[PDB]
C-alpha cells in the first residue's frame, strides 16, 4: 500500500507566517521525528480569489523540480477544506530578516548568494523550460547551513524553450522588469533583471528603484541609470548595470547562451559552476540555530501567537509523496 499523508501524522509546533490564504506552521512528522514547514491553504480563499491557476502551477513546478537551491516539496495532500504543502524546513529564515539587520552584505556574501540563485535559475530555464518571474528578496530563504532556498513557484511560466515569449502581467511592482512594464511579449531574461534587483539590495542596502507612488517608481525602472556606493567595486557595478539594462536583448543573460552570459562575467571570476551546484562553496554565514524548533530567524509577530485551527476535481494532480528521505 502507497504511503498516505494526512494532517494527524504531524505535530503543530510554531506559527511562522499567517495571512488571507492561510498559514505556515513548523511541524514534526510523528513517525520519523523530522521537521517541515507546512503551508496550509484554505480551499475557499484560493477558489474565491482566482488563485487556483497559481496554486496548481506551484504544485506542478514543486513536483517536477529538484535543485539544491529550490525549495523542495516532501508531501502535498488535501482535506475537503484544506491544501497542504509539506515543505523542506529552511531554519535560516528569510534572507530579508538577515539583510534588514545587517543593512548590507559584503561583495563576497552577495557573490555566494547570487551564484546559488544563478545555479537555480539556469536549471529552471535550461532543464525545465520554466521562467520563474517572481525573483525578489521576499522569496529567498536560508537553509540550516546558510545556503539559499528560492520559494514561491506560483508565478512560474512552464513550456518556455529557447527565445519563447510570455504575456502575463505579474510580479512585485518594485521588482518588475522594464519589458514587463512596457507590456511587450517578454522572455526568460526577466529572471536576470530579478537577479540584478536582489544583488543590488544585497551589496547596496536599498532597492535600485523606489517611490511610494507606482507611476513614478516605473519611470525610474524605465529610465534612471542606477546610482551606486563609493565602497562598491567596479566588477559589482558592471554586474548590476549589466543585469539592470532596460533592454532584455542588451541585458546580461538576455542572449542565447542565457545564464552562461552571467556565469562568465568578471564579478564571478574564479567560481567553478559545477561546485556552486555541489554546495562545495562554504557559506559566508552559518545560521546559529540550536535545534529545529529554534525560530530565532523568524518573525516574533507569528512565533509568539498560539496555534488555533480556523470544487474537488480542480485540485486533481495536487497530491504528492517524494521519493527521497529526510
Ligand atoms: C513554507 C516556506 C517555504 C519553504 O519551502 N520552507 C519554509 N521553511 C521555513 N519557513 C517558511 N516560511 C516561514 C513563514 C513565511 C511567511 N509566510 C507568510 C504568509 C503570509 C500570507 C499568507 F497568505 C501565507 C500563506 F501562504 F501561508 F497562506 C503566509 C508570512 N510569513 C512571514 C512574514 N514574511 C513573508 C514575506 C514578508 C515577511 C514564509 C516562509 C517556509
PDB file of N, CA and C in Angstrom, residues 89-93 98 142-146 285-298:
ATOM      1  N   UNK A  89      12.060  22.398   5.637  1.00  0.00           N
ATOM      2  CA  UNK A  89      12.108  23.494   6.602  1.00  0.00           C
ATOM      3  C   UNK A  89      13.412  24.308   6.491  1.00  0.00           C
ATOM      4  N   UNK A  90      13.311  25.610   6.110  1.00  0.00           N
ATOM      5  CA  UNK A  90      14.521  26.430   5.968  1.00  0.00           C
ATOM      6  C   UNK A  90      14.797  27.145   7.289  1.00  0.00           C
ATOM      7  N   UNK A  91      15.687  26.560   8.155  1.00  0.00           N
ATOM      8  CA  UNK A  91      15.977  27.071   9.520  1.00  0.00           C
ATOM      9  C   UNK A  91      16.604  28.414   9.556  1.00  0.00           C
ATOM     10  N   UNK A  92      17.239  28.818   8.464  1.00  0.00           N
ATOM     11  CA  UNK A  92      17.876  30.121   8.421  1.00  0.00           C
ATOM     12  C   UNK A  92      16.926  31.282   8.278  1.00  0.00           C
ATOM     13  N   UNK A  93      15.642  31.022   8.091  1.00  0.00           N
ATOM     14  CA  UNK A  93      14.652  32.094   7.958  1.00  0.00           C
ATOM     15  C   UNK A  93      14.753  32.820   6.635  1.00  0.00           C
ATOM     16  N   UNK A  98      17.630  38.710   7.603  1.00  0.00           N
ATOM     17  CA  UNK A  98      19.080  38.839   7.703  1.00  0.00           C
ATOM     18  C   UNK A  98      19.670  40.119   7.112  1.00  0.00           C
ATOM     19  N   UNK A 142      17.182  30.966   3.800  1.00  0.00           N
ATOM     20  CA  UNK A 142      18.458  30.301   4.042  1.00  0.00           C
ATOM     21  C   UNK A 142      18.159  28.959   4.692  1.00  0.00           C
ATOM     22  N   UNK A 143      18.827  27.898   4.251  1.00  0.00           N
ATOM     23  CA  UNK A 143      18.637  26.621   4.941  1.00  0.00           C
ATOM     24  C   UNK A 143      19.463  26.609   6.276  1.00  0.00           C
ATOM     25  N   UNK A 144      19.455  25.503   7.011  1.00  0.00           N
ATOM     26  CA  UNK A 144      20.198  25.385   8.270  1.00  0.00           C
ATOM     27  C   UNK A 144      21.732  25.579   8.084  1.00  0.00           C
ATOM     28  N   UNK A 145      22.292  25.365   6.850  1.00  0.00           N
ATOM     29  CA  UNK A 145      23.730  25.577   6.581  1.00  0.00           C
ATOM     30  C   UNK A 145      24.113  26.935   6.045  1.00  0.00           C
ATOM     31  N   UNK A 146      23.135  27.743   5.639  1.00  0.00           N
ATOM     32  CA  UNK A 146      23.439  29.055   5.097  1.00  0.00           C
ATOM     33  C   UNK A 146      23.423  29.096   3.592  1.00  0.00           C
ATOM     34  N   UNK A 285      27.763  32.789   6.017  1.00  0.00           N
ATOM     35  CA  UNK A 285      27.070  32.893   7.279  1.00  0.00           C
ATOM     36  C   UNK A 285      26.461  31.572   7.636  1.00  0.00           C
ATOM     37  N   UNK A 286      26.741  31.115   8.838  1.00  0.00           N
ATOM     38  CA  UNK A 286      26.171  29.880   9.313  1.00  0.00           C
ATOM     39  C   UNK A 286      25.057  30.177  10.327  1.00  0.00           C
ATOM     40  N   UNK A 287      23.770  29.882   9.995  1.00  0.00           N
ATOM     41  CA  UNK A 287      22.677  30.121  10.956  1.00  0.00           C
ATOM     42  C   UNK A 287      22.997  29.447  12.268  1.00  0.00           C
ATOM     43  N   UNK A 288      22.798  30.178  13.365  1.00  0.00           N
ATOM     44  CA  UNK A 288      23.216  29.730  14.693  1.00  0.00           C
ATOM     45  C   UNK A 288      22.160  29.028  15.498  1.00  0.00           C
ATOM     46  N   UNK A 289      21.236  28.350  14.823  1.00  0.00           N
ATOM     47  CA  UNK A 289      20.121  27.595  15.420  1.00  0.00           C
ATOM     48  C   UNK A 289      20.613  26.450  16.322  1.00  0.00           C
ATOM     49  N   UNK A 290      20.062  26.357  17.524  1.00  0.00           N
ATOM     50  CA  UNK A 290      20.440  25.303  18.468  1.00  0.00           C
ATOM     51  C   UNK A 290      19.742  23.983  18.123  1.00  0.00           C
ATOM     52  N   UNK A 291      18.483  24.046  17.645  1.00  0.00           N
ATOM     53  CA  UNK A 291      17.647  22.906  17.237  1.00  0.00           C
ATOM     54  C   UNK A 291      16.731  23.322  16.081  1.00  0.00           C
ATOM     55  N   UNK A 292      15.884  22.412  15.590  1.00  0.00           N
ATOM     56  CA  UNK A 292      14.936  22.741  14.521  1.00  0.00           C
ATOM     57  C   UNK A 292      13.779  23.579  15.054  1.00  0.00           C
ATOM     58  N   UNK A 293      13.539  23.563  16.370  1.00  0.00           N
ATOM     59  CA  UNK A 293      12.478  24.386  16.964  1.00  0.00           C
ATOM     60  C   UNK A 293      12.970  25.819  17.263  1.00  0.00           C
ATOM     61  N   UNK A 294      14.292  26.062  17.097  1.00  0.00           N
ATOM     62  CA  UNK A 294      14.880  27.381  17.287  1.00  0.00           C
ATOM     63  C   UNK A 294      14.405  28.275  16.121  1.00  0.00           C
ATOM     64  N   UNK A 295      13.486  29.213  16.432  1.00  0.00           N
ATOM     65  CA  UNK A 295      12.888  30.137  15.488  1.00  0.00           C
ATOM     66  C   UNK A 295      13.395  31.552  15.603  1.00  0.00           C
ATOM     67  N   UNK A 296      14.659  31.686  16.007  1.00  0.00           N
ATOM     68  CA  UNK A 296      15.384  32.942  16.157  1.00  0.00           C
ATOM     69  C   UNK A 296      15.434  33.807  14.892  1.00  0.00           C
ATOM     70  N   UNK A 297      15.367  33.170  13.693  1.00  0.00           N
ATOM     71  CA  UNK A 297      15.450  33.925  12.439  1.00  0.00           C
ATOM     72  C   UNK A 297      14.106  34.121  11.787  1.00  0.00           C
ATOM     73  N   UNK A 298      13.071  33.969  12.591  1.00  0.00           N
ATOM     74  CA  UNK A 298      11.672  34.138  12.208  1.00  0.00           C
ATOM     75  C   UNK A 298      10.995  35.287  13.007  1.00  0.00           C
TER      76      UNK A 298
END
